[PDB]
Amino acid sequence: ARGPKKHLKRLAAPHHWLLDKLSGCYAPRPSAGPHKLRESLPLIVFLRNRLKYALNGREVKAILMQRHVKVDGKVRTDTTYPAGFMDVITLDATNENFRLVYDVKGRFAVHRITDEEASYKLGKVKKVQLGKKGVPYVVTHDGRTIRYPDPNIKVNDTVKIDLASGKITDFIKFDAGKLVYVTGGRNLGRIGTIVHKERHDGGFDLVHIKDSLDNTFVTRLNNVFVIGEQGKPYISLPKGKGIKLSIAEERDRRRAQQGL
């Protein structure tokens, strides 16, 4: 096409933004960044399509010009920034400490955290590599890069890096028993266990998972995201917990929790 696309149409946007068919032709086209745009969420969306603190991109960009935001400990003023999973976002003037994570519906759940735990996030490890000068370095799901880690970290693990210094802290491996978040697909948002792994060398290893309800479900390895140990979340969890109700049970909860 003689070049990349600086545009995005509505009805091509991610369905998990809960936008409308209508209100125009075009849509925000997330900028470059750590989070892949289908995997991501814009600032305007978190605000204007999840918070309703504002209406228009005018108001949004005005707010960002006021520098009202940090993101993982840093301001970012692009309306089309690609926010995403396990981000940390904090507001000062309202003193809101958020963290980005899906619903069990796979929708980027509004999970408010405290001032602490807006002091730590996780990074699942994409690759660890013997960088040059013999240096070891390693990168994360959220587009960062660190050197001199703990070497016992290995691929597919996660780590509790701190936030702003960087600075890996104690971390979590991948073996039987651990606790997990799901980051893609039909089981998206779900939470469970390691119960076994179906290693398929050459490609597409899978992981059998079991939620608290002994609902088993098996997923792609790459969508795996360790989050602590079983009965031991290293973070704060939203509502729903990746427990994956039936629509029947959901209905039941609607009509029941409705009333009084």
Which residues sit at the interface with another protein, rule CB under 8 A?
A: 52-54, 58-59, 62-63, 66, 68, 91, 93-94, 135-136, 147-148, 150-151
CB 29, min distance to another protein, A: 24
233 binds, among RNA, another protein, none (CB under 5 to 8 A by kind): none
Nearer to another protein, 93 or 176 (CB): 93
C-alpha–C-alpha distance, residues 229 and 235, integer Å: 11
CB proximity list for 129: less than 8 A, separation 6 or greater: 136, 137, 138
Does 11 participate in binding RNA (rule CB under 7 A)? yes
147-174 b/e (C-beta count within 10 Å ≥ 16 → b): eebeeebeebbbbbbebeeeebeebbeb
- Taking CB under 7 A as the rule, which mask of x and - marks residues 120-159 in contact with RNA? ------xx-xxxxxx--x-x---xxxxx------------
Which of 56, 166, 186, 198 lies at the binding interface for RNA (CB under 7 A)?
A: 166
C-alpha–C-alpha distance, residues 210 and 218, integer Å: 8
CB 223, min distance to RNA, A: 13
- Taking CB under 7 A as the rule, which mask of x and - marks residues 214-253 in contact with RNA? ----------------------------------------
Decide the pairing of beta strands 158-161 and 123-130: antiparallel
Nearer to RNA, 11 or 256 (CB): 11
- Taking CB under 7 A as the rule, which mask of x and - marks residues 184-213 in contact with RNA? -------------------xx---------
